Design a binder for these strands. Sequence first.
DNA 1: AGCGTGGGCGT
DNA 2: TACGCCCACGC
Length: 88
Amino acid sequence: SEKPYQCDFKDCERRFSRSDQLKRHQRRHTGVKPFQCKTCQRKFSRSDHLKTHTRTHTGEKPFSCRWPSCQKKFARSDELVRHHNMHQ
DNA sequence: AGCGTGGGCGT
DNA sequence: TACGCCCACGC
Ligand SMILES: [Zn+2]
Ligand SMILES: [Zn+2]
Ligand SMILES: [Zn+2]
């Protein structure tokens, strides 16, 4: 597809289809972290990454292993993916 | 293993 | 613009 939103930061060649995609990416350059955890006051560049971070404080693990007699659960989907891959 | 985080992707 | 899924990489 077409990607009209190009990043002009020094030595960056990243380009995107949407303007929010560019603005999100550019936070990696500036170090801006607009989202703060209300529990430990750590700051984050993104709201979705703040959300999964908060689960470290509560121990909430919404993603359970489907293998029989395996009670392993995880805070994020990608953790479960790696776990399921492990089970062969 | 647990999680920061960069990017794709949808709504 | 926001919101929050997924996937992968690299500690
Ligand atoms: Zn850039
Ligand atoms: Zn926190
Ligand atoms: Zn398992």
